[PDB]
Ligand binder design. Structure first.
Ligand SMILES: CC(=O)c1c(C)[nH]c(-c2csc(CN3C(=O)CNC3=O)n2)c1C
Length: 103
């Protein structure tokens, strides 16, 4: 629906963010040993983009839950001072700041 256009925009802003590079596609289990074993519910921005593109979100709250899941997964798997771990903390605040502009 057009009701979620503002979420398409937030997602775009996230995809184009300097700290977005870890989160653009699903983590590859061939490259990150045991990732999908440790992280039960992987999530990434392309998966979110596809769900928006097909109209698969029933609410903006569902979209925000997926965003937070990206960052919760990152914090679960990565150290705070690692490059991916640093990026996840940057991106969480970015998402939160944009969400707070509507809520
Ligand atoms: C373990 C973890 O939580 C990771 C996440 C969420 N993301 C990445 C990661 C590393 S690299 C990358 C994107 N990427 C390529 O796949 C090729 N060049 C490039 O920048 N994502 C990791 C390791």
């Amino acid at each position: 629906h057009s009701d979620l256009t503002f979420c398409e925009i937030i997602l775009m802003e996230m995809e184009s963010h300097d700290a977005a590079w870890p989160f653009l596609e699903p983590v590859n289990p061939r490259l990150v040993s045991g990732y999908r074993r440790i992280i039960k519910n992987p999530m990434d921005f392309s998966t979110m983009r596809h769900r928006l593109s097909r109209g698969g979100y029933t609410s903006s709250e569902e979209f925000a839950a997926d965003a937070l899941l990206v960052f919760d997964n990152c914090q679960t798997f990565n150290e705070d001072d690692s490059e991916v771990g640093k990026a996840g903390h940057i991106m969480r605040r970015f998402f939160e700041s944009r969400w707070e502009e509507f809520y």
